[PDB]
Amino acid sequence: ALLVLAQSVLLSVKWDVEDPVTVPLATMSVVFTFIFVLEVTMKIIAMSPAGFWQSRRNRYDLLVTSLGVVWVVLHFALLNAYTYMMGACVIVFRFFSICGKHVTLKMLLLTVVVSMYKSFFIIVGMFLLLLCYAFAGVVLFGTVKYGENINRHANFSSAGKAITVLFRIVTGEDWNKIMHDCMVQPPFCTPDEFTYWATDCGNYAGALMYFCSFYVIIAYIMLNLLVAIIVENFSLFYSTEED
Amino acid sequence: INKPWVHSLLRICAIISVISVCMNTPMTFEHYPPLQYVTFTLDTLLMFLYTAEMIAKMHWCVFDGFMVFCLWVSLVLQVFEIADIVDQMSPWGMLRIPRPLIMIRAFRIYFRFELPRTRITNILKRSGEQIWSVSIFLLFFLLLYGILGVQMFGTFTYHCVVNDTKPGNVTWNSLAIPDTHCSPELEEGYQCPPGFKCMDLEDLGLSRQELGYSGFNEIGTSIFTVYEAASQEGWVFLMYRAIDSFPRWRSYFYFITLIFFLAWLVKNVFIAVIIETFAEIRVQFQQM
Amino acid sequence: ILSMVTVDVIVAASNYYKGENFRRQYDEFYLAEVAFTVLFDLEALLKIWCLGFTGYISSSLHKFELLLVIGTTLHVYPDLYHSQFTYFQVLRVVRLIKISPALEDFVYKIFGPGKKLGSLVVFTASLLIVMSAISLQMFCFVEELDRFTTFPRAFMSMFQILTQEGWVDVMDQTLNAVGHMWAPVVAIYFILYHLFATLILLSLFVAVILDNLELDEDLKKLKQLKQSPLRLRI
Amino acid sequence: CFTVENADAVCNLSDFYLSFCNSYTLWELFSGLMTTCRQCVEAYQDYDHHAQEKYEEFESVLHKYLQSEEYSVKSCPEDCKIVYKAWLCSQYFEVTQFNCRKTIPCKQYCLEVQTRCPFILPDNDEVIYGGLSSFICTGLYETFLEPECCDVR
Amino acid sequence: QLYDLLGLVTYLDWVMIIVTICSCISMMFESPFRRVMHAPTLQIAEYVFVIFMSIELNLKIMADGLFFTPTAVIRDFGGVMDIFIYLVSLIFLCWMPQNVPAESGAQLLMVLRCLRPLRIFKLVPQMRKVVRELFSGFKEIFLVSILLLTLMLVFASFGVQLFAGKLAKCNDPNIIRREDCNGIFRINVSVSKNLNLKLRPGEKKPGFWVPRVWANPRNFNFDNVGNAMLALFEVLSLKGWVEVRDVIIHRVGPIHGIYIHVFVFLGCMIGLTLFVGVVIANFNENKGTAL
Ligand SMILES: CC(C)CCC[C@@H](C)[C@H]1CC[C@H]2[C@@H]3CC=C4C[C@@H](OC(=O)CCC(=O)O)CC[C@]4(C)[C@H]3CC[C@]12C
Ligand SMILES: CC(C)CCC[C@@H](C)[C@H]1CC[C@H]2[C@@H]3CC=C4C[C@@H](OC(=O)CCC(=O)O)CC[C@]4(C)[C@H]3CC[C@]12C
Ligand SMILES: CC(C)CCC[C@@H](C)[C@H]1CC[C@H]2[C@@H]3CC=C4C[C@@H](OC(=O)CCC(=O)O)CC[C@]4(C)[C@H]3CC[C@]12C
Ligand SMILES: *[C@@H]1O[C@H](CO)[C@@H](O)[C@H](O)[C@H]1NC(C)=O
């Protein structure tokens, strides 16, 4: 476990061809792999190979080790960016394996993953609501004059932009300034009499209803479902000594 | 000490003492010089009373002894600084840092448990163990996303600067409005338009303090930024800097997953822990 | 009486901004407030004459309404009009809670036994005061830093950190003020305070509210033992 | 059609336009707003110079606005510059103009700026503007609308 | 598990789900400059949707009935929602206007047309279950909302009474009196919040000349009850509340700094926690472990 953690700490600096420091650290990553290979060899030579295979964690370890060996072989031949990114990813995937080693860590990881799995339908419902609001936002505000917080990034000019800004608003950050930007009326804009796509300012009451409804619904109600799910799963799995 | 009236007096004195230490501040006396003598007076008077207590206890108390020692030190420092031999803006005021804790004494009566304290201790032990476990969980995820940020997101110090900007001449007038990050790549990131060019401000000689602490230059600052983002305070602006500076998909995957995992679920684990603590209170005492 | 409360609060909220040209210390809304406070004084005096003073005070609602009567009689003193005492004017709306027994039962359920939430509030206040004084005595002398130049400002800053709004900005400005040798320990203090505030205290509020909505375990066992034409009707 | 160049040569006045604020004519200024005429021409020139300087400042501010071609589907930077120029020039010369062909109230130009010119966020360092635009015309419950100016749009 | 999944719903339901997904994918390409009304490519999905919906409804009506039957196509909110969606779609297809004035009936119809994805809720049984569970505690959510509304009326009335028209400050910090705010001044323009560049001794921050105006802040004011309530609603989210605090303190004097802070305590810390508690309690009740 300690060796795993050290190898994970080897990623403290960005691996980069230009940076000379990258060359030593890459070499430093090689030896660890070999050591890790021994860890596999031991475990596969103490038990029958089938016995080693029986434990899923052993399977994961063997997969990671084989990937690392492939990376080692490539690194000495190509020596390009691809090798360095592959090695960094191998090290990340190995570091993530520490969860199985510890007990409480494993329990909490199981809790989190199970909560994610059991929340699928709720998340789908949130997505469907967000998509409806995205379409309505593109219709109402897709041509709003740029303002305090509508800009290149926060924009309703296409469904993807609308979805991203709505997800932001689910995180809450400055939703009200976007709302007030969408309120913009004359003389701050040039209105159009025939088409809504030829003008550059949005709808007052539409903005109020849209943003207030979306915020109340998503942020005050729906997330508490996921909170409850986390609570339930934590109770289910996490269990220390019991009197 | 015998009369309950003494204990009531000592508790109101504790409240007066915390008020006094809240009042003692250089700009307070700069605004209301007379309070300088008020602060001193209360500071001495209360100390006398507590001295009596220390004298009368010879026939947990270490806390009260430390507190009366701190009152002594504070009174000495106040005598020194009213003499004007030590600058009122000097750091020595830090000697008063532990005096506010006197507030605890005001509630000490409620802190007293006569029932089987063992049960309370067990509850607190369970809660501490759980909190430590979840703390290790959170720290592991923070380190993971730290190293991920260091590898993917480089350093956010390239900016669009006016075409003819020169080193050392960097100034407000050299930046675009609003200040936009950039990438030297021809295909990735934002492309500075005509009359502007992308370059690293840090090379021009700005300090890290002047550039700001946030960023993914090293594991420490990476995990610092990750914790900041996981607080949901300023994450979208960091995402925008990353989108302008690097391939968009990296920023989207990183920040969306960070917000999904850390900012909702992991925080909710502490809510679950505290709910279980209350469930244990229900099981053990059934009377809270 | 409840209708008069409603009309009074509606009139009081209707004192919208018209223009700088005309506004006076005597205006129709002042006379309305005087009339309503007189009416409530009359109501309280009559109720006391009926029930006797001890009988009147015997119930919490009558103590609350007596407090409001006193406050809103002080409120009409022309030097205090629209002072802080205006709170007593608006709190009359709470009388309307008695219009629905369902909402009343929900209130008493969700706020539960007052000891719990009361002690949690007192703990929050004490912790905020202590940490604010601590931060004041660490930072008040630091030049270029206003956020902790006095106790009220320190309290505002620690409360901002509790809300989590711009807390990173308070931190950044503090690390600007202190020298880089000290920035790490200051950052660690701020981080630990934010962590404790956000993960435990708010979780304590959530747990308290959930435990208020939860039934008592003895009531649960009692319930378990006790508990063992459509649209076409036209 | 004779942009005033020399202060002495100038002194029909209805044919001598200013250098920067070409839209106005000396006749107009003489109406509403030998050595005496030299002092007046010199004053006009100095005002023109100041206006030019401030206009250059505005142009330099706007040029760094990278979102110049995206902030509005109905407005372009050129109309912004035009209406800001007309606004500043009117500010310096609060006179009714007589000899143009189509005309509007001068004050309206101020609205035109906030209609056509982008939303520049003011610095919040000594005062919280709370999302208030840098260029605003109407105050709290202030009835905005007087002289007339030429419809240079 | 594959066989069980394939039997989750009827074949007609699966076809309709597929059609809906296709329609929404097509709608995802609609933009203010790539309108379906003028882009034939996008019209195919709409046509297919409408035709298949019509076939579905025609089949189901004469098998169950719209009314006065033991089983009916429309007997709960789901059927009402589906019928409303179908009618909106059909009306849009029949009309399909060429000009959509801003804030008009055409725009309203277009917006209502965006509710199409909701059909998945009814078609997918698990989504229906989720919705029912969520709406079980509607009464408790309503009561919490009434409590928050009462709090907001208290504080709105107080804010209107005390602060009405006092938040207006001259945009020029230098000038202090209303009568002296006339003409033009030089206003600096925000360059970069995060950067901390130090201006040179002989340099001025970028800015330009703007008229002086005695104007209220854009994002909030307390002129009337509505604006006060909107401001307080914004302050419940905990975003931008520090700006409100600073404005109140500087323009209305520092004692009224109490006013906002207590609200934050009562509204945000306690009040919003009521929603979390209620929803978790209702979730546990529905799960069946409450007793
Ligand atoms: C323990 C509980 C019950 C409350 C304790 C809170 C006290 C510590 C507070 C309450 C009143 C506060 C004082 C209220 C007002 C001021 C004025 C303030 O003066 C100014 O800054 C204004 C300067 C000017 O503009 O003239 C300095 C802080 C001080 C003394 C405050 C210090 C802290 C005090 C004593
Ligand atoms: C609370 C738990 C979950 C972990 C959070 C991490 C913090 C405990 C520490 C560890 C790394 C620390 C950082 C490590 C490095 C720096 C770099 C330092 O900047 C410099 O090194 C420049 C020195 C100079 O310019 O003189 C400022 C403090 C900071 C951000 C430290 C702030 C506090 C951090 C984030
Ligand atoms: C069985 C239950 C679910 C009833 C559902 C009925 C819907 C099909 C109704 C309700 C709202 C109606 C709409 C309300 C308002 C308008 C505005 C109207 O706008 C105009 O174009 C007229 C004014 C103009 O053209 O200037 C056109 C009809 C329409 C879309 C209506 C079409 C039919 C709708 C969608
Ligand atoms: C602009 O910045 C300068 C400092 O360079 C300052 O003196 C001036 O007051 C600022 N402008 C405004 C409107 O505050």
Side-chain angles (χ1 to χ4, degrees), chain C residues 125-207:
Chain C
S126 304
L127 176 66
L128 277 160
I129 292 156
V130 172
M131 301 305 288
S132 303
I134 288 171
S135 305
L136 182 69
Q137 298 302 341
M138 293 183 287
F139 296 117
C140 63
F141 71 83
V142 176
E143 305 90 345
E144 321 170 49
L145 185 65
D146 50 10
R147 309 200 81 80
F148 300 94
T149 193
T150 59
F151 176 82
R153 289 178 165 124
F155 183 98
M156 293 183 286
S157 301
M158 302 307 278
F159 188 89
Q160 178 169 355
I161 294 156
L162 179 58
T163 66
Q164 299 182 21
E165 183 67 341
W167 84 268
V168 294
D169 273 298
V170 187
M171 207 169 59
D172 182 60
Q173 290 186 345
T174 311
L175 303 181
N176 289 337
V178 303
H180 303 165
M181 189 47 196
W182 304 99
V185 75
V186 172
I188 289 164
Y189 173 75
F190 272 40
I191 290 160
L192 291 172
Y193 172 72
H194 173 271
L195 190 62
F196 182 90
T198 60
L199 302 185
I200 298 179
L201 198 75
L202 297 181
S203 302
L204 289 167
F205 284 99
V206 184

Side-chain angles (χ1 to χ4, degrees), chain D:
Chain D
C1 59
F2 285 113
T3 73
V4 172
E5 275 316 275
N6 189 359
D8 292 320
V10 61
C11 64
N12 305 76
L13 301 167
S14 86
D15 203 287
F16 297 99
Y17 292 7
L18 302 171
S19 182
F20 180 59
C21 298
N22 56 47
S23 62
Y24 294 83
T25 306
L26 272 156
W27 171 250
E28 273 66 359
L29 298 104
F30 281 114
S31 313
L33 172 76
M34 286 310 268
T35 61
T36 52
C37 79
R38 293 183 183 174
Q39 305 298 47
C40 297
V41 179
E42 287 297 76
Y44 299 151
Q45 309 263 289
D46 283 340
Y47 289 160
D48 268 331
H49 206 94
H50 295 177
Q52 191 177 5
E53 294 215 275
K54 301 168 160 62
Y55 184 65
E56 293 179 353
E57 267 194 0
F58 172 75
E59 292 180 274
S60 75
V61 171
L62 189 62
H63 168 264
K64 294 133 75 177
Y65 199 64
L66 308 186
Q67 314 163 120
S68 71
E69 67 91 23
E70 310 172 36
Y71 75 98
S72 194
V73 304
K74 270 259 174 190
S75 302
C76 295
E78 318 311 327
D79 304 357
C80 173
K81 274 184 299 182
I82 289 164
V83 300
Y84 183 83
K85 186 181 186 292
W87 170 79
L88 177 75
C89 279
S90 88
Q91 296 294 321
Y92 279 109
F93 299 119
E94 190 170 306
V95 63
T96 61
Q97 188 153 15
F98 294 0
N99 290 318
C100 290
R101 303 324 288 187
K102 295 183 293 179
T103 185
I104 62 170
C106 304
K107 275 182 101 143
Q108 182 61 2
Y109 273 90
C110 180
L111 307 186
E112 301 287 53
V113 172
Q114 56 171 302
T115 306
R116 292 224 171 90
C117 278
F119 184 93
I120 311 291
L121 189 73
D123 176 344
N124 293 327
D125 63 358
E126 69 189 29
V127 64
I128 300 298
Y129 284 109
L132 196 66
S133 189
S134 72
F135 204 109
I136 57 165
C137 310
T138 312
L140 176 47
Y141 276 42
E142 307 293 349
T143 301
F144 186 62
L145 76 171
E146 306 290 23
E148 293 82 3
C149 294
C150 295
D151 210 11
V152 285
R153 294 181 341 250

Side-chain angles (χ1 to χ4, degrees), chain C residues 12 16-17 82 84 86-87 90 93 103 106 110 121 159-160 163 165 205-206 209 213-214 220 224 231 234, chain E residues 68-71 140 143-144 154 158 161-162 223 238-241 245 256 259 264-265 273 277-278 290-291:
Chain C
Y16 67 88
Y17 184 68
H82 286 182
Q84 309 306 308
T86 314
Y87 285 114
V90 297
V93 71
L103 182 63
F106 175 76
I110 197 165
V121 168
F159 188 89
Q160 178 169 355
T163 66
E165 183 67 341
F205 284 99
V206 184
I209 293 298
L213 293 167
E214 192 79 342
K220 285 181 187 176
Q224 289 180 29
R231 51 178 184 290
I234 188 167
Chain E
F68 300 166
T69 59
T71 180
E140 303 300 296
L143 293 165
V144 172
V154 173
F158 183 102
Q161 286 177 71
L162 280 81
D223 288 354
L238 299 179
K239 309 302 183 303
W241 82 263
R245 180 199 73 195
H256 302 111
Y259 166 86
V264 164
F265 185 68
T273 302
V278 168
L291 281 294

Side-chain angles (χ1 to χ4, degrees), chain B:
Chain B
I1 197 171
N2 307 314
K3 323 311 193 195
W5 273 11
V6 184
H7 302 332
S8 300
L9 172 68
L10 268 57
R11 291 155 75 254
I12 58 184
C13 289
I15 305 305
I16 297 169
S17 190
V18 66
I19 289 162
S20 189
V21 62
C22 293
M23 283 202 99
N24 193 6
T25 295
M27 278 63 74
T28 304
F29 307 140
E30 181 165 301
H31 293 173
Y32 309 91
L35 278 286
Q36 177 67 275
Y37 308 111
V38 177
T39 305
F40 182 74
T41 299
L42 281 293
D43 212 28
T44 193
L45 286 160
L46 300 166
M47 181 276 316
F48 270 101
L49 187 166
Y50 291 165
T51 314
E53 193 191 29
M54 210 66 207
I55 295 152
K57 269 293 195 74
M58 71 155 177
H59 41 258
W60 186 252
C61 196
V62 179
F63 179 80
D64 281 331
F66 184 33
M67 292 311 260
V68 70
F69 179 35
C70 290
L71 276 156
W72 270 128
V73 174
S74 178
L75 185 66
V76 169
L77 179 62
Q78 186 63 256
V79 171
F80 276 125
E81 79 199 6
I82 192 53
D84 299 13
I85 79 182
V86 62
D87 187 351
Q88 187 58 90
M89 282 268 271
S90 65
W92 296 104
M94 300 215 198
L95 279 294
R96 315 185 164 86
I97 281 174
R99 179 161 80 180
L101 301 177
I102 202 165
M103 181 93 60
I104 294 165
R105 204 188 209 284
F107 302 103
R108 207 218 294 275
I109 61 171
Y110 307 156
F111 195 84
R112 181 81 87 205
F113 291 115
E114 305 79 5
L115 78 164
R117 162 174 170 293
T118 59
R119 305 234 288 273
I120 297 89
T121 58
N122 291 116
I123 302 163
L124 277 293
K125 293 276 189 300
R126 265 180 50 94
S127 308
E129 289 299 271
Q130 296 177 351
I131 290 289
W132 181 244
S133 295
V134 296
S135 66
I136 302 289
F137 192 65
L138 175 68
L139 182 44
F140 153 76
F141 277 62
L142 289 173
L143 209 65
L144 177 61
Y145 277 140
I147 67 179
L148 282 171
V150 179
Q151 309 286 23
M152 305 192 328
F153 291 139
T155 289
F156 301 164
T157 59
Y158 290 93
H159 302 69
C160 282
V161 303
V162 168
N163 185 76
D164 301 85
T165 301
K166 310 313 316 183
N169 291 340
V170 187
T171 182
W172 289 120
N173 305 52
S174 70
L175 306 178
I177 293 166
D179 171 34
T180 51
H181 294 263
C182 65
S183 180
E185 293 297 280
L186 171 60
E187 52 269 26
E188 297 297 355
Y190 180 62
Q191 301 304 337
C192 294
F196 294 92
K197 54 166 48 165
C198 184
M199 65 183 73
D200 183 352
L201 295 174
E202 182 179 2
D203 181 2
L204 307 196
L206 282 67
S207 72
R208 183 170 193 74
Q209 192 84 20
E210 193 161 37
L211 292 160
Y213 281 100
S214 61
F216 304 98
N217 60 295
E218 188 167 10
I219 197 168
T221 53
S222 88
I223 190 167
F224 189 32
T225 303
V226 170
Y227 185 93
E228 282 169 24
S231 78
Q232 299 166 337
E233 196 65 17
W235 85 264
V236 303
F237 305 119
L238 183 65
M239 170 185 200
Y240 300 161
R241 300 189 213 116
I243 287 174
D244 292 356
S245 185
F246 290 114
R248 306 175 68 84
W249 76 267
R250 296 183 185 173
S251 308
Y252 285 115
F253 170 83
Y254 185 99
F255 291 105
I256 298 297
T257 59
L258 188 161
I259 295 298
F260 183 81
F261 289 108
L262 312 196
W264 303 340
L265 309 188
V266 178
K267 308 311 182 163
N268 300 345
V269 187
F270 291 92
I271 296 170
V273 167
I274 299 291
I275 289 166
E276 180 63 22
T277 297
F278 274 59
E280 200 84 30
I281 279 178
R282 291 284 270 286
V283 177
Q284 298 254 33
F285 290 136
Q286 307 172 23
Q287 73 196 351
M288 180 276 311

